[PDB]
Amino acid sequence: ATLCLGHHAVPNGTIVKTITDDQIEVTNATELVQSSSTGKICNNPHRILDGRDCTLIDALLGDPHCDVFQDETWDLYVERSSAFSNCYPYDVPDYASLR
Amino acid sequence: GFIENGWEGMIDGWYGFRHQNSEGTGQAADLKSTQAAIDQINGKLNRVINEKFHQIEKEFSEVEGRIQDLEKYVEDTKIDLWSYNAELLVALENQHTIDLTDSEMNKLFEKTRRQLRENAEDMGNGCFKIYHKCDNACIESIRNGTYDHDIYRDEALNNRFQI
Amino acid sequence: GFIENGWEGMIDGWYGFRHQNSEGTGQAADLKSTQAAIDQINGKLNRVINEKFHQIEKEFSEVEGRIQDLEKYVEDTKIDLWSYNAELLVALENQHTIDLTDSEMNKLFEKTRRQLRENAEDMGNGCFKIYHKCDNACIESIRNGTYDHDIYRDEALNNRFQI
Amino acid sequence: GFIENGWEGMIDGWYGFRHQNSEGTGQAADLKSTQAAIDQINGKLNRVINEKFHQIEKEFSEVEGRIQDLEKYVEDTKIDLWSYNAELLVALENQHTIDLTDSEMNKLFEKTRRQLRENAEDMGNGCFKIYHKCDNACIESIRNGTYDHDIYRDEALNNRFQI
Amino acid sequence: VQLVQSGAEMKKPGASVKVSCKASGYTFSAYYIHWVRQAPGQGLEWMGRINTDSGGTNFAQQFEGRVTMTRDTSISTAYMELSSLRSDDTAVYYCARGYDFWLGSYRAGGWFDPWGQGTLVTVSS
Amino acid sequence: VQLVQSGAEMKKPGASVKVSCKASGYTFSAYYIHWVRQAPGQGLEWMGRINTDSGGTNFAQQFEGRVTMTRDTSISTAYMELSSLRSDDTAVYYCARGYDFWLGSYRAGGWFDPWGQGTLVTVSS
Amino acid sequence: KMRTGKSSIMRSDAPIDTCISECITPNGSIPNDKPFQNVNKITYGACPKYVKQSTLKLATGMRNVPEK
Amino acid sequence: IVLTQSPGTLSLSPGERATLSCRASQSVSSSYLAWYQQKPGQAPRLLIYGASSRATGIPDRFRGSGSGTDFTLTISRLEPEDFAVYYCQQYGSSPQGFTFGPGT
């Protein structure tokens, strides 16, 4: 002899931010910004060439300690902060363009 | 809107019914409205969720001048524009989500009201007062969409108007 | 959504009426609501439908480096942002168009309901039942806004409640 | 909607009531809906109202070439994109404000209708016809939400149906 | 919205005739197709109708055992096959789309629109 | 949604026992908390309920003057304190959340859910 | 020999691990399911767009009106 | 309001129908009665509320009925796990009224 209509609720829901108000509670929400990383670089499906202690120009010119990079191919070369040069001192005008 | 609060005893749906009659009280969920809600929400989510390989240098180790400032300016412009886009997108889509859910609730209310015809009268709190004997099968028929108002119309009219 | 299907046989308007009475069936369109919908849609079209003369080079035949990469990056950023803007604009405008058309249909339904008063009762399929003899002049009066409900109220109430 | 024109005699609110009964006519404002609409408008204003210090040059005194056209292009692109964003934002916000105000008016109307129950009947112009002696305390009770419909139901139904 | 039919057929008595009716401009499987026959100098004579979705057919209680109606949704064409031809079976055969007037949950009348151009079938020796 | 209670207490006769009930998974201040007693080999016996917002309490006309119930909304725990323990007071004490069934403007019925695990209180010398 | 392709360079100190990820950043590889990221503006591959906001929640339910 | 349950014990073989009856002292609203199941060593588990409605995950073999002063709980088929002590509760009849039944 009486019939009520209603909707569900949750004990505590996420606060979402809409046009009118910046704090309105909602049953469920999803995050859209990735703010975490694993700290490690995957090797698939891209071919990554870790340079160790060699810069790209060092391997290009043929630094003696960069002889492991002869005739190498990559999809992403990773340059490390520990890279150093051990040959005749050189400078490259327009270093960035060549790199 | 006229519904005051949600029901935390509902865990098998989003929208539903509550009733009281001579044989007691009960609760049931409406699948057609919950499914429509989730269908719209997922269809919207899938449109919210680029492939760039070689780009400009974004962090610098030396102080150079004109070119470095231009690269920094380009990067900041791109970042601010995309941040604004993200903020506006999420705000608009949350708004549309809220209105679509409220609209689904209102649609369910209006459909029940139209089914009941002159046999019930709205009480203003999201509830109807059925003016005839409505057992469990009666409530089931109201819920699944097979309620016949002509077999209760005489008694409902007698109870409603003449005292 | 309470109106299930459209009418492919009414080609003189967007919203209209269909009736049955003692003198037969008929169909007529509503000019005011169709015109309102068309004006809103065209006003929205006109807002959707820059003069650049000298810009940067966008195609390159030699490999140079820093400057060419900066130019390519700037152009790619501009294209991506404008593509996203176009997609968002069209999605929003289509959603608004659909919502406004549904609202116009609901407005016409509510206007007819408020015209009829206690002389008719909604059947739930988006369309009414009138409880008194209603010839073609009667339907015309309902359609053009000059329907007087007090001269049919007595027999409508007799037919509605007293069987 | 059904409410045609606004009342310029109201200077104490946004939405209000007008009435006529045996003791005369009157006007009053409903602060609950006016405050809700005002709060929504101020909230949407607070989201609308960056600190860049060193940027690229934007005005030049010589003709140089590649670099200068690159910076002019970057600045022009940024200005065009932000102009588009501003236009779209204000247009959407204005549409939403108009919609929300109309929705608040309709909400007040529907709350009053559900309050009156079978005692009054809609006339189609935003006005109700209360079918019983409704003195000033009666109108007050309808206005603040303390209208008991079960004590006027007999006379309202007698006047409504039987002539 | 139009309906296009086949050409004239000079069939001999005691044979079979097939007349095609191709629909263009509307969903073929959404409306019924009615076959009307007009003898030379006389009025129209309803033969039957075919459902273009489920393949159901409803003839008149004068053509039973002589008319079979089939549909081809792939090419949007409805066929009429008439057997046991006679001299009196010479007429112009029309295919018409039947529109039902749906007033919500119930239908109330309708009309035939559009009509085909008509194919003249002659039976003679 | 669960209720976790304190441990077993072997209090001596003529003393007082405090039994806690910690609520996790729902807003503690939004629902009543009820205390039900089950003696070994007997049925359940309602003792009382405490309003978790206003601190209001309502006992049975059998435990008046012996039971005090307090709340702590900061830690979300309901305490039942029963004084003047006797031999018949050895039982298993439960805390259950009362869910009132709201049909719009009025309440009609309900149920007890969820329940606590129960604390076995023994009174002996 | 000079070839045109998808090759690029990156400055990072992160280690290399056998895994599958379509997006590489100097802070490490990140998933691409979400449309935005706030990890780093230097990206390689199919990556979410960089934003300044640390959080951006999208509503997947209705308004929560709890019981009393 | 005092609730009385009969019979005290029911000796029924598996697969049979079980009918349990709980009677009220005075007439009470059918909206107030609930049924609980308590296996040994466990807190009671809600079975039926409102004298006719099952809980969230209670199988369709538990059926509630009754109105006025006589209420019944019926089990169509007795599964092995359905052997416990069943209680009837009145909920909300009064601010002090939340009593249980004797048990069965």
Burial of D86 (0-12, 13-18, 19+ CB in 10 A): exposed
| Distance (Å) of CA E67 to CA C120, D57, E57, E75 | 47, 87, 10, 22
Give whole-number Cα distances, E113 to A95, E42, F60, in Å.
79, 21, 81
Distance CA(G44)–CA(E12), nearest Å, equals: 80
The dihedrals phi and psi of G22, each to the nearest 5 degrees, come to -90, -10
Q: Answer yes or no: do F109 and H34 touch at CB < 8 A.
A: yes
Select from D50, D55, D95, D161 the residue whose CB has the most chain B CBs within 10 Å, as the one to mutate to test that interface.
D55
Residue of A nearest to C67 (CA): A97
CB contact under 8 A, F104 and A4: yes
Residues H55, H57, H63, H69, Cα dihedral to 10°: -20
Note whether A10 and G64 are within 8 A (CB): yes
B94–A96: do the CB atoms touch at under 8 Å?
A: no
Q: How far apart are CA D88 and CA C89, in angstroms?
A: 9
CA distance F100 to F108: 7
Question: What does DSSP say about strands B120-122 and B127-130: parallel, antiparallel, or unpaired?
Answer: antiparallel
Q: Alpha-carbon distance H104 to H100, whole Å? A: 12
Omega within 30 of 0 (cis) for the link into G66: no
Q: For chains A and D, what is the number of CB pairs under 8 angstroms? A: 12
Q: How far apart are the CA of D103 and the nearest CA of chain C, in angstroms?
A: 12
Answer whether C74 sits within 8 Å of B71, measured CB to CB: no
With touching defined as 3 or more inter-chain CB pairs under 8 Å, the answer for chains G and H is no
Show Cβ contacts of residue F101 under 8 Å, excluding neighbours closer than 6 positions. B9, B18, B25, F107, F108, F109, F110, F111, H31, H49, H50, H92
Please provide the distance, in angstroms rounded to a whole number, between the alpha carbons at the two ends of chain D: 30
Q: How many CA atoms lie within 13 A of C47 on its CB side?
A: 13
d(CA H85, CA H104): 5
Cβ–Cβ gap D56/B69 under 8 Å: yes
Concatenating the DSSP letter of every residue in C18-56 gives: EEEETTEEEEEEEHHHHHHHHHHHHHHHHHH-----S--
Chains contacting chain B through 3 or more C-beta pairs under 8 A: A, C, D, F, G, H
Q: Is A20 on the interface with D (CB under 8 A)?
A: yes
Here the contacts of C74-80 (C-beta below 8 Å, separation 24 or greater) are: C74/B74, C74/D70, C74/D73, C74/D74, C74/D77, C76/B52, C77/B74, C77/B77, C77/B78, C77/D77, C78/D77, C78/D81, C80/B50
Instruction: State the nearest Cα–Cα gap between A17 and chain D, in angstroms.
Output: 10
* Tokens describing residue C150: 């007090």
Instruction: Tell me the helices (H) and strands (E) count for chain D, helix number first.
Output: 4, 4
Closest C-alpha among E67, E75, E80 to residue E19: E80
Cβ atoms of residues E79 and E73 within 8 Å: no
Task: For residue E118, count CB atoms less than 10 angstroms from its CB and return exposed for 0-12, middle for 13-18, buried for 19 or more.
Answer: middle
Method for this entry: cryo-EM
Expressed in percent and rounded to 5, the helix, strand and coil fractions of chain H are 5, 50, 45
Q: Which of F25, F103, F104 sits opposite A11 (nearest CB)?
A: F25
Contact B17 A3 (CB under 8 A): yes
Determine, for residues E103 and C20 on separate chains, whether the beta-carbon distance falls below 8 Å: yes
Helical (H) or strand (E) element with F50: strand F44-50
Q: Does B83 touch chain H (CB under 8 A)?
A: no
* Measured distance CA(B74)–CA(C81) in Å, rounded: 13
C89 touches D: beta carbon within 8 Å:
yes
- Closest to E60 in 3D by CA, of E86, E35, E80: E35
**What is the spatial distance between Cα A64 and Cα G21, in angstroms, rounded to a whole number?**
33
Cα diameter, chain H: 41
Longest distance between any two alpha carbons in chain B, whole Å: 93
Asked if A39 and G27 touch (Cβ cutoff 8 Å), the reply is: yes
SS3 H46: strand
Cβ distance of G66 and F102 shorter than 8 Å: no
- Cβ under 8 Å to B: G residues 9-38: 11, 33-36
**Which of A21, A22, A23, A24 to substitute to test the interface with D, most D CBs within 10 Å?**
A21
Please give the Cα distance from H87 to B76 (Å, whole number): 69
> What is the CB-side half-sphere exposure of residue E103 using CA atoms within 13 A?
17
Nearest Cα residue to G62 out of B95, F102, C96 = B95
Residues of C in contact with D81 (CB under 8 A): 78, 81-82, 85
- Candidates C87, C101, G23; CA nearest to A40 is G23
Q: Calculate the alpha carbon distances from A25 to B102, C113, E79 in Å.
A: 14, 37, 63
Chain G residues whose beta carbon lies within 8 Å of the beta carbon of residue F102: 67
| DSSP letter string, E18-47 | EEEEEEESS-GGGSEEEEEEE-TTS-EEEE
**How far off is chain H from F68, nearest CA to CA, in Å?**
15
Q: Are strands A76-79 and G8-11 parallel, antiparallel or unpaired?
A: parallel
3-class DSSP assignment, residue F20: strand
Closest chain F C-alpha to A19 CA, distance in angstroms: 28
Q: What count of residues does chain D have?
A: 163
The residue in chain C having the minimum alpha-carbon distance to the alpha carbon of residue D85 is C85
State how far the Cα of C80 lies from the Cα of C90, in Å rounded to an integer: 16
Collapsed DSSP state (helix, strand, coil) of residue C110: helix
Question: Cα(B52)–Cα(B48) distance, rounded to whole angstroms?
Answer: 19
